[PDB]
Amino acid sequence: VKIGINGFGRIGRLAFRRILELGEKSIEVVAINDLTSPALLAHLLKYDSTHGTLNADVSATDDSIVVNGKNYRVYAEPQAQNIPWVKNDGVDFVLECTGFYTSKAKSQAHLDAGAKRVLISAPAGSDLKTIVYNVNDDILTADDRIVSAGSCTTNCLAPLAFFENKEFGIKVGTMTTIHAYTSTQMLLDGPVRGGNFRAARAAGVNTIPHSTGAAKALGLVIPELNGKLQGHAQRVGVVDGSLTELVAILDKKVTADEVNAAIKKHTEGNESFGYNDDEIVSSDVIGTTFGSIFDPTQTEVTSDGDNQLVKTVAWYDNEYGFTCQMVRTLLKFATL
Amino acid sequence: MSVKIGINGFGRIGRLAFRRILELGEKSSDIEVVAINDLTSPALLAHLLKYDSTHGTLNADVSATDDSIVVNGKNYRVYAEPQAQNIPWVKNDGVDFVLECTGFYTSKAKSQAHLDAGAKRVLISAPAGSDLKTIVYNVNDDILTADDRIVSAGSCTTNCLAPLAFFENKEFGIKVGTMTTIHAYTSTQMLLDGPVRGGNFRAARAAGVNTIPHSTGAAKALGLVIPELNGKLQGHAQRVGVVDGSLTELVAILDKKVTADEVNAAIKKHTEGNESFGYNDDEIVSSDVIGTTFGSIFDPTQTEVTSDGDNQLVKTVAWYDNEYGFTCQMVRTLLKFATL
Amino acid sequence: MSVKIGINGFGRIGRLAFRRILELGEEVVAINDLTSPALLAHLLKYDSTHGTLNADVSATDDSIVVNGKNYRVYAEPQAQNIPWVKNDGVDFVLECTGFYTSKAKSQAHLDAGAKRVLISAGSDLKTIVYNVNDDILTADDRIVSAGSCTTNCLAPLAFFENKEFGIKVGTMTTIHAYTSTQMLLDGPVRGGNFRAARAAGVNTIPHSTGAAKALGLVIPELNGKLQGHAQRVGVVDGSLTELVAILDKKVTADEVNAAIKKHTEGNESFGYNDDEIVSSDVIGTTFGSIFDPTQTEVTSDGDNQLVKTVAWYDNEYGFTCQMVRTLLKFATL
Amino acid sequence: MSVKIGINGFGRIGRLAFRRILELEVVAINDLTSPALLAHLLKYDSTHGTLNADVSATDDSIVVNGKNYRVYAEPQAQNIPWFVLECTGFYTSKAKSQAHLDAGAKRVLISAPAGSDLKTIVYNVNDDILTADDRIVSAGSCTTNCLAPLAFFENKEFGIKVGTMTTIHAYTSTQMLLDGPVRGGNFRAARAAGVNTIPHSTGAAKALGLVIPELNGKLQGHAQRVGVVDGSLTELVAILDKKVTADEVNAAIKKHTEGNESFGYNDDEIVSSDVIGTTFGSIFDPTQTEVTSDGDNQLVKTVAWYDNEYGFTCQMVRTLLKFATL
Ligand SMILES: [Hg+2]
Ligand SMILES: [Hg+2]
Ligand SMILES: [Hg+2]
Ligand SMILES: [Hg+2]
Ligand SMILES: [Hg+2]
Ligand SMILES: [Hg+2]
Ligand SMILES: [Hg+2]
Ligand SMILES: [Hg+2]
Ligand SMILES: [Hg+2]
Ligand SMILES: [Hg+2]
């Protein structure tokens, strides 16, 4: 089970780390494609301000990265179709991390170059499947060649909305994610691509509203919720570690203790959707393997007569969590 | 014959109140601080009045004596009485009204002390129970009469949520709502993980490198300010890693079916020329509100209406300087004390 | 009677220059920039470091408006094509892009009508730190460097310390606010530097600087005598320099303090603060450098001595006010 | 049979010592805060992550991986039934720490500077001077454990005539989140830590004499507290007895790092984050070395990183273990 990684950004590198750890106890990466000198790439794989230092020997050569005596070639093709990693290296699936190949059409380029399947790490349209592992990965079939993992937010929200709706019937809901700052943001105020007024502001010293598609597109993952949710984000001054607040009108009348026990059930042995009642904070989830961690301590039911609002919340390592989700799906690709 | 204020407790709010009243003094409001009570050395207080990591350096000449703080050549005595009934500032200095921001006189019964020391009225910078009036300026200040000698300003959050909720209810009717305030870290929080007053596992965590959930009673208590919303709202807080500047999200079920443009138009009219409840549609972020004089600033760009047949959710958002805004609200209430 | 200023590059520094020129009140007439006027007006109006400009700011399709005055914004990628000489009568170009940074390349501005050009950060042109060596400017000068943000802090301290006591050798470390060149999270960066690649908000990060080494351009007696580097730390703005030196005179901290202090009297460029301030207190200050006597330390064991001195600076605002001071002089030579 | 540590004061350092000793002998704890909160803080940490063990509490004890650790609550240490690691900050004297000796403890290791009538030990610099009569030892400070080996080794190779240090240091517990009064009244201690670079006094260099006697009187320094939660670095600028080059200095210092668990080496161009959770008291970084000369006047700058919490604590443990051989 061999992976080629297109784009050795933060998610790309974390996928490397994750597959490496997994491989120590039982799929493997064989090649990477990226414009950066491998020397720097190796450095960024070894040292991480968020995730710590990789316990392994890392070096580079002029065309590769080396870990624990193994050589991982890095190509530098700006057009995916020219990546020779299939004949050259044995690549089965491509993890597509670049943000540039974000549609079925665009990613065909990988197929043209011989890859069996592709997993894109972002929303990539409605003409292919959007998978959140442990929610709708069962809909995968052998025919599925280009797939989308959705977003980091999708992977947190989906299971919460999924099970909440199955227990109680979500009529309508709104979401706010209080999200760590990201690479698309700036250190200091200044112009940015797209020209967005908020995109342009200093990430580390502001709370910054930000648009997401997560909720609005949730129907690609949970079709009965199409048209039922909207949301946005607030970008705040931490490096990593996020949380999502969902507020919904339900079909059923509930208490907070009832909501908590119902959802808890669905976290039992679930590697994608966890549970924590220790009153954690954001830092506590950095480096966790779940795509979403339900926090019963924040559950709130507001009612007067029989107008009811229910707020639930889940934590997530928007980096590491999302990535572990994508690796689960790469793995499910082998079984198709 | 100016309004004369005693400030009890020269902490962050006290100091800002001093600065605001000083600024108003320059184009005379006729309000002035004549005295302070605090147990910290005047030279440290003076240092903290002059320099501030959030709100900048005061453009005034500031120094200390061993019992006062001197500003632009005027002397402001700093009393040091741990018990408020002992502060001699009414007789010594002309104090009319006390601004009480210590956090220790947080009830009608406790603040009686100021009256016993001869203060005409007291404004408490915090929630202070239900046997006195809780006033949010420009929402319910019209309820004040001459018999009100001890008044509560509610909290910083109350001062943000109140007008939003008030005007939204007025226009559309709030059946039920919940709020989440995304809030700058505060004085009560810790720099690093460790034990804390009260024992709370969350309070105990490092504030600059975490998003920390936190309890609030602003929503639950809003009935004190807007009786019709009693028992209609709940909420909480997320403390985030900025020094100042906050926002509240309100999620409500309304009586009317609405659109976003409609909610926006309706709330907007109530911000116009409203010195307490402002408006900004320039797509601002939290630092843009640091230093603003509003108790709450409505942000139309974040409005959201979610609709699936008959069921509707409305989300509105307001920004505030949890320090400066709150404080300018209180100063407005003080000025209003003079009209009673 | 006035000399008309064009600004190439409306980045942080260029916008601060505008605010500074606006504030001095008793004049810019055009801008050149790649970014839409709307975003630029927004970034002029709002700032996470320096606050909200107290002026009416708005934008059009091809300009930004401040207090009823129109400031045309060209969008020419190539400096030689900017037409603000004819169109808007430009006399002087303030150049803050980073892409012209030599006599060679700033010649484009003169090719297009400009009298003089002020840049920031070679050797075939004068580097001017106002109130240290602006005297060397002459009418012959066409292109001049204001030096760097760091140079404008270090120059005056080093000049005056050397003047009074004689610097034999010295090393500096500037504990510096994070900058635009740095990154929010770990990843590849232009140049490829391993430390440049790291998360700036949550690390202390060593950084190469050239200010000490090039100080010779400003204070010829100090050429070859100083070295230094930076540590980039987690604040948006506000920085300090520590200079450690071997001096030709044996001294006490007070001797050093009193000596350096007289050079700050009425000095709008090199100030003095002994109130025990911290970095955020210098944000918004107009000095290129603010001596802090409270941090002065003399270490000695018998006749072997080291002297440590410290100055603070707003690396944004202080540097820019220095550029403004130079602009005022240059333009009217 | 094997050695039983008792920890007085379950603060950040005490807790990290607990964790480190578990990773590698502690049987009881004395702290005035509730076992539940202690438990939560042992399990979760913003800086050092979550403990990979199962932790719980009771009414009088902390439970980990099955084993149970009693938490006594005595404000007077004579009164703790139960070597002692003294982390409290309140027993900062040979005389004060006599209390733990009154309670029957063999030896006491104080995790702070504790005068000159006891020995201050930096493990792997001067731990050899310890003997069976020393019942109360100081481990000096976090900074002391970083500065010591660097200065010791540089001094032994080149001879320091005079030196000054600046440690660029993560913010600490004594500091505040927002501006306001603090105990002692210092104008700078009163200022918001997360958004300032803040000068702070230090005594580590002046006092280095207690660890390295030939350096007595030759060093001074200070700190700049900056906006990160952990991870620090020290710059030393010194006049030496010999002429050198940067390469020479690096080669010379590097050789004392070989197999040195207390003083390490890193030449990958790291940053503060990189040292968090590292086990060394100090890490030499040769990429930052600088020699400045004109004529025959020479200044030498060397730099070492450290985790001011984790390094210090791992240094302390190494000393606790050495107590045993004694
Ligand atoms: Hg990438
Ligand atoms: Hg979620
Ligand atoms: Hg991962
Ligand atoms: Hg609000
Ligand atoms: Hg105010
Ligand atoms: Hg410039
Ligand atoms: Hg300087
Ligand atoms: Hg300026
Ligand atoms: Hg050190
Ligand atoms: Hg440790």
Side-chain angles (χ1 to χ4, degrees):
Chain A
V1 224
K2 293 166 173 32
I3 313 291
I5 303 187
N6 196 28
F8 220 42
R10 284 186 73 65
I11 290 335
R13 302 197 300 273
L14 282 183
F16 193 108
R17 283 201 184 189
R18 188 37 181 189
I19 284 160
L20 212 240
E21 167 202 353
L22 285 179
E24 257 154 32
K25 234 236 186 121
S26 124
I27 134 187
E28 25 148 30
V29 181
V30 298
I32 300 168
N33 180 62
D34 197 88
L35 47 156
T36 314
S37 73
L40 181 48
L41 297 188
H43 187 70
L44 300 170
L45 173 69
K46 178 69 184 188
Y47 300 107
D48 195 271
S49 313
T50 302
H51 305 286
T53 301
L54 182 56
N55 188 7
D57 306 313
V58 191
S59 31
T61 85
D62 51 348
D63 69 6
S64 82
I65 269 173
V66 185
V67 187
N68 295 343
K70 261 113 117 82
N71 192 73
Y72 304 86
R73 167 113 94 125
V74 3
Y75 298 95
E77 301 296 337
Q79 278 143 47
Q81 7 115 169
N82 300 148
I83 305 166
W85 44 18
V86 187
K87 28 139 194 145
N88 287 23
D89 296 283
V91 159
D92 301 312
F93 318 136
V94 170
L95 180 62
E96 159 66 57
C97 115
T98 76
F100 269 60
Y101 295 80
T102 236
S103 70
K104 198 200 193 200
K106 280 161 185 227
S107 267
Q108 187 67 58
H110 283 297
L111 273 4
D112 291 352
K116 310 192 175 25
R117 293 162 166 111
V118 177
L119 177 63
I120 313 170
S121 73
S126 34
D127 67 359
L128 42 60
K129 300 182 188 178
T130 296
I131 303 309
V132 175
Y133 192 91
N134 254 338
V135 178
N136 70 335
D137 63 279
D138 51 289
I139 75 157
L140 281 174
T141 71
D143 230 327
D144 290 309
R145 280 190 150 213
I146 300 178
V147 173
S148 158
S151 75
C152 64
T153 307
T154 297
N155 286 257
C156 173
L157 173 71
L160 182 58
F162 189 62
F163 301 106
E164 196 174 311
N165 183 59
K166 283 155 74 67
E167 304 273 351
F168 306 116
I170 292 168
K171 307 254 114 242
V172 82
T174 191
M175 166 218 63
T176 291
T177 176
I178 311 174
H179 197 287
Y181 57 62
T182 72
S183 295
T184 57
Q185 288 179 271
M186 311 266 291
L187 224 19
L188 294 188
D189 318 294
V192 58
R193 59 8 124 150
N196 185 259
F197 284 16
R198 282 165 171 153
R201 312 297 303 269
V205 295
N206 288 294
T207 295
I208 301 172
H210 178 56
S211 283
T212 51
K216 199 152 97 300
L218 198 60
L220 309 177
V221 188
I222 307 161
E224 63 177 288
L225 296 175
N226 185 62
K228 297 192 170 30
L229 313 159
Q230 293 188 307
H232 79 160
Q234 303 290 1
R235 296 283 179 84
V236 296
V238 293
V239 292
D240 196 32
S242 305
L243 79 49
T244 303
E245 299 200 343
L246 177 64
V247 176
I249 296 168
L250 300 186
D251 171 66
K252 267 169 95 131
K253 204 161 269 220
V254 304
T255 64
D257 276 357
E258 174 191 358
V259 171
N260 289 342
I263 288 150
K264 194 182 180 207
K265 229 322 155 154
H266 301 275
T267 72
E268 280 181 3
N270 188 332
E271 279 182 346
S272 289
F273 181 47
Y275 172 99
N276 191 300
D277 72 330
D278 280 337
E279 307 163 48
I280 47 153
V281 301
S282 54
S283 268
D284 299 322
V285 311
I286 291 170
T288 61
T289 48
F290 313 92
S292 186
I293 315 181
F294 180 66
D295 186 3
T297 77
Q298 290 182 75
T299 301
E300 187 193 83
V301 180
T302 306
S303 196
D304 200 61
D306 53 10
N307 289 307
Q308 198 160 77
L309 282 171
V310 182
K311 177 190 278 169
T312 45
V313 181
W315 301 92
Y316 72 119
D317 192 326
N318 48 285
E319 273 172 14
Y320 207 89
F322 176 48
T323 297
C324 287
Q325 279 288 93
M326 281 191 269
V327 168
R328 295 180 181 113
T329 292
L330 288 178
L331 271 163
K332 172 96 169 201
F333 279 5
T335 78
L336 296 175
Chain B
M1 356 71 75
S2 79
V3 179
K4 298 178 190 56
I5 307 305
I7 297 158
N8 196 30
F10 218 51
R12 296 196 58 78
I13 301 310
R15 302 194 296 273
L16 291 173
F18 190 106
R19 289 190 176 190
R20 176 62 167 172
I21 289 169
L22 182 76
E23 163 180 59
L24 293 181
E26 289 159 0
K27 13 183 267 139
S28 188
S29 237
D30 269 15
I31 185 172
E32 71 186 282
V33 172
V34 312
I36 303 158
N37 182 61
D38 196 276
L39 313 172
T40 300
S41 94
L44 177 54
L45 288 184
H47 181 63
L48 302 165
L49 177 70
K50 172 71 170 169
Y51 298 106
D52 193 272
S53 306
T54 293
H55 297 292
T57 304
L58 221 205
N59 198 31
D61 295 299
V62 181
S63 53
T65 71
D66 6 0
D67 72 6
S68 74
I69 284 180
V70 178
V71 177
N72 288 348
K74 162 138 178 43
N75 202 69
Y76 300 86
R77 180 109 168 56
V78 181
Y79 295 110
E81 307 287 349
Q83 260 71 213
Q85 65 266 24
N86 291 330
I87 315 163
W89 52 15
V90 171
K91 62 249 220 180
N92 294 2
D93 305 284
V95 163
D96 300 305
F97 311 137
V98 179
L99 183 71
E100 168 54 61
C101 193
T102 69
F104 293 112
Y105 291 92
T106 250
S107 81
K108 223 232 265 195
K110 286 153 177 208
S111 264
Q112 177 69 34
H114 293 300
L115 303 192
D116 292 346
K120 293 179 185 37
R121 327 187 180 266
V122 187
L123 185 55
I124 304 170
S125 72
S130 69
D131 60 342
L132 38 54
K133 293 173 185 178
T134 295
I135 303 301
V136 172
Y137 194 92
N138 255 334
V139 170
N140 71 335
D141 62 285
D142 265 33
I143 77 167
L144 285 163
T145 65
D147 307 305
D148 296 302
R149 300 201 105 72
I150 307 175
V151 173
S152 168
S155 69
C156 53
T157 312
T158 294
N159 276 274
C160 182
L161 173 79
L164 185 53
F166 176 85
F167 293 112
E168 187 170 329
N169 182 53
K170 199 195 170 109
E171 297 290 345
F172 299 117
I174 288 160
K175 297 193 176 168
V176 89
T178 184
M179 62 108 153
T180 295
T181 173
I182 302 141
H183 198 294
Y185 55 62
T186 71
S187 262
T188 63
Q189 288 172 269
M190 311 262 283
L191 201 44
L192 299 193
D193 314 305
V196 58
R197 262 107 149 309
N200 182 272
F201 292 9
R202 262 156 182 168
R205 309 298 307 270
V209 300
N210 286 302
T211 296
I212 303 166
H214 175 79
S215 298
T216 49
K220 244 194 351 264
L222 198 64
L224 308 169
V225 186
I226 307 155
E228 28 294 295
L229 285 180
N230 184 51
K232 284 184 181 55
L233 304 168
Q234 294 203 296
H236 83 150
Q238 310 285 1
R239 302 283 179 86
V240 290
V242 289
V243 289
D244 196 31
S246 304
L247 72 59
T248 307
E249 305 198 339
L250 183 55
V251 173
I253 300 179
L254 301 176
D255 278 329
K256 264 85 174 202
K257 197 168 122 298
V258 290
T259 61
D261 292 345
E262 170 185 4
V263 168
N264 284 346
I267 292 144
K268 192 180 189 229
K269 69 193 142 195
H270 298 280
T271 68
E272 310 279 25
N274 188 327
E275 76 253 48
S276 289
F277 187 40
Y279 180 94
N280 189 305
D281 78 328
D282 286 340
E283 292 165 64
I284 57 180
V285 296
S286 69
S287 71
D288 298 321
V289 318
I290 299 168
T292 60
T293 57
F294 300 104
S296 171
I297 304 162
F298 180 54
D299 188 1
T301 79
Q302 298 190 59
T303 302
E304 176 197 278
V305 175
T306 310
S307 222
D308 171 69
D310 324 280
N311 299 289
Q312 181 189 82
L313 277 173
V314 186
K315 179 196 272 168
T316 52
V317 180
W319 301 95
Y320 65 122
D321 196 319
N322 46 282
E323 286 180 3
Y324 215 83
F326 185 40
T327 299
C328 296
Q329 277 295 85
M330 293 196 288
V331 169
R332 294 179 178 108
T333 288
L334 292 183
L335 284 163
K336 159 90 162 186
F337 275 179
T339 73
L340 306 182
Chain C
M1 89 292 199
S2 90
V3 172
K4 313 257 164 292
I5 305 192
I7 307 185
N8 198 43
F10 219 46
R12 290 192 63 75
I13 301 308
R15 297 191 300 276
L16 293 182
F18 186 100
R19 296 196 169 188
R20 175 66 173 178
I21 295 156
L22 177 67
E23 109 191 336
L24 289 171
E26 26 36 71
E27 181 213 354
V28 181
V29 312
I31 301 175
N32 187 61
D33 197 274
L34 42 159
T35 292
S36 74
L39 183 50
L40 288 178
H42 184 72
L43 295 173
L44 182 66
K45 175 66 167 162
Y46 299 100
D47 193 84
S48 296
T49 302
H50 305 285
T52 300
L53 180 66
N54 187 28
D56 302 316
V57 178
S58 50
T60 71
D61 49 325
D62 78 354
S63 84
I64 94 234
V65 181
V66 183
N67 289 353
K69 193 151 141 49
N70 192 57
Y71 304 96
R72 170 78 155 104
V73 181
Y74 304 98
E76 292 287 347
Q78 235 64 34
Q80 60 252 52
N81 301 327
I82 312 161
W84 47 17
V85 188
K86 189 121 72 60
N87 305 33
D88 319 79
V90 159
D91 277 328
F92 210 89
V93 171
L94 169 56
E95 157 67 46
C96 334
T97 65
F99 300 110
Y100 297 77
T101 37
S102 93
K103 181 181 167 142
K105 358 182 138 140
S106 278
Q107 176 77 49
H109 292 299
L110 328 160
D111 286 357
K115 276 163 213 358
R116 297 186 211 274
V117 185
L118 186 56
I119 320 161
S120 120
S123 115
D124 68 286
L125 49 54
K126 300 187 188 175
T127 305
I128 296 304
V129 166
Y130 195 90
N131 247 38
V132 176
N133 67 335
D134 54 281
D135 261 17
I136 76 173
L137 280 164
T138 74
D140 278 297
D141 285 312
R142 291 257 123 153
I143 297 176
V144 168
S145 163
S148 75
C149 67
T150 299
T151 301
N152 277 265
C153 177
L154 171 75
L157 183 70
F159 179 71
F160 292 123
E161 180 165 350
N162 179 62
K163 218 261 217 7
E164 303 283 326
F165 307 116
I167 301 186
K168 289 188 164 152
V169 262
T171 196
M172 77 132 208
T173 299
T174 165
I175 296 118
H176 202 284
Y178 57 64
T179 75
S180 267
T181 57
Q182 274 176 283
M183 249 164 358
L184 193 44
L185 304 179
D186 313 310
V189 51
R190 152 171 227 156
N193 180 271
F194 284 14
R195 292 181 155 140
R198 314 292 305 265
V202 298
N203 284 299
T204 303
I205 301 172
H207 182 62
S208 285
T209 51
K213 193 140 71 272
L215 201 41
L217 305 171
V218 182
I219 320 179
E221 52 268 41
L222 284 175
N223 176 71
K225 295 198 214 319
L226 306 169
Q227 291 189 314
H229 77 161
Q231 310 272 1
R232 292 287 181 88
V233 295
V235 287
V236 266
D237 204 19
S239 307
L240 71 80
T241 312
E242 311 196 343
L243 178 65
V244 172
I246 305 188
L247 312 178
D248 194 46
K249 304 282 179 292
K250 310 287 193 277
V251 296
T252 65
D254 302 323
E255 281 155 15
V256 167
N257 287 343
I260 281 143
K261 184 171 172 200
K262 31 171 246 251
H263 299 289
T264 66
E265 311 290 356
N267 189 338
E268 45 168 43
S269 280
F270 178 53
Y272 175 90
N273 186 300
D274 72 332
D275 279 339
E276 283 175 76
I277 48 153
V278 297
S279 59
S280 74
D281 302 311
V282 310
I283 294 165
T285 60
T286 52
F287 298 105
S289 184
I290 303 178
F291 185 58
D292 189 2
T294 77
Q295 293 191 73
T296 303
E297 168 199 272
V298 185
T299 305
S300 73
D301 186 64
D303 61 17
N304 305 298
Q305 176 198 75
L306 292 167
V307 184
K308 186 189 282 179
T309 50
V310 185
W312 297 89
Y313 65 114
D314 188 330
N315 44 285
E316 269 171 16
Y317 208 87
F319 175 44
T320 296
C321 295
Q322 280 295 93
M323 279 182 7
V324 176
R325 273 157 199 135
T326 299
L327 240 169
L328 277 148
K329 207 204 179 203
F330 202 178
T332 351
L333 250 171
Chain D
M1 296 144 286
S2 99
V3 122
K4 332 235 126 64
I5 288 94
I7 306 183
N8 193 42
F10 216 47
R12 289 191 72 58
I13 299 302
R15 295 200 300 267
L16 286 186
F18 192 108
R19 289 191 179 188
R20 170 67 164 180
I21 282 150
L22 162 77
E23 151 150 73
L24 295 180
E25 0 140 349
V26 16
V27 310
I29 297 190
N30 183 63
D31 198 88
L32 262 49
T33 124
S34 112
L37 183 37
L38 295 198
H40 184 75
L41 301 167
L42 186 54
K43 176 72 183 198
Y44 299 109
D45 193 79
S46 299
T47 303
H48 302 293
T50 306
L51 180 51
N52 196 325
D54 295 297
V55 179
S56 54
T58 79
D59 56 321
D60 76 352
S61 105
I62 289 174
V63 173
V64 193
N65 278 346
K67 266 153 250 223
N68 183 84
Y69 315 73
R70 176 108 169 69
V71 172
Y72 305 95
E74 302 288 54
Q76 319 107 167
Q78 316 82 271
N79 302 336
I80 319 168
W82 84 348
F83 328 128
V84 171
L85 173 64
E86 168 54 61
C87 303
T88 67
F90 284 91
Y91 291 100
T92 260
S93 265
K94 156 188 271 187
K96 270 132 163 223
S97 282
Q98 197 52 39
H100 285 108
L101 291 187
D102 296 357
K106 267 144 233 193
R107 280 161 220 280
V108 181
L109 181 63
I110 306 167
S111 73
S116 32
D117 49 13
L118 23 69
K119 315 196 167 150
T120 299
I121 308 292
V122 169
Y123 195 91
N124 235 57
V125 175
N126 79 342
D127 64 286
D128 274 341
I129 79 182
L130 278 184
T131 67
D133 263 302
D134 302 295
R135 306 258 248 110
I136 307 188
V137 179
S138 166
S141 73
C142 64
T143 314
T144 296
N145 282 260
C146 170
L147 173 77
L150 177 67
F152 176 89
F153 292 116
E154 183 173 331
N155 182 67
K156 132 137 78 174
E157 300 283 327
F158 307 109
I160 290 153
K161 309 217 217 215
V162 76
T164 184
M165 70 119 163
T166 296
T167 155
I168 310 174
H169 203 277
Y171 58 66
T172 79
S173 293
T174 64
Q175 288 180 265
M176 315 248 291
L177 206 43
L178 302 189
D179 317 304
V182 31
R183 300 127 84 259
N186 179 260
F187 283 11
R188 287 177 160 149
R191 304 295 305 267
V195 297
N196 288 296
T197 292
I198 314 189
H200 173 90
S201 289
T202 204
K206 263 239 312 94
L208 199 49
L210 301 176
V211 184
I212 313 174
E214 36 281 321
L215 284 177
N216 181 46
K218 299 172 170 288
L219 313 182
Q220 290 195 325
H222 88 157
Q224 308 282 4
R225 294 291 178 79
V226 301
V228 301
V229 297
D230 194 36
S232 319
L233 68 89
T234 303
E235 301 184 354
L236 166 72
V237 183
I239 304 182
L240 301 179
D241 282 336
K242 317 194 124 81
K243 264 69 247 282
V244 292
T245 58
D247 288 329
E248 181 181 12
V249 174
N250 282 352
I253 281 139
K254 188 189 175 173
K255 71 206 194 188
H256 297 275
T257 68
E258 313 278 354
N260 197 338
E261 76 175 11
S262 282
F263 179 50
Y265 177 87
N266 188 302
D267 96 313
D268 289 337
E269 297 164 88
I270 53 168
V271 287
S272 49
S273 274
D274 295 320
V275 309
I276 302 170
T278 56
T279 56
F280 309 102
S282 163
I283 316 167
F284 186 55
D285 174 8
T287 66
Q288 297 192 64
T289 298
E290 193 201 68
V291 176
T292 313
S293 8
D294 195 70
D296 334 66
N297 290 296
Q298 177 190 83
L299 279 173
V300 176
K301 180 195 279 164
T302 54
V303 177
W305 299 89
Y306 63 119
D307 181 327
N308 39 297
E309 293 179 345
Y310 215 86
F312 186 38
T313 303
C314 301
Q315 281 286 98
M316 271 180 355
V317 171
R318 289 182 185 108
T319 293
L320 281 189
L321 281 170
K322 175 156 211 290
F323 269 4
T325 70
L326 244 75

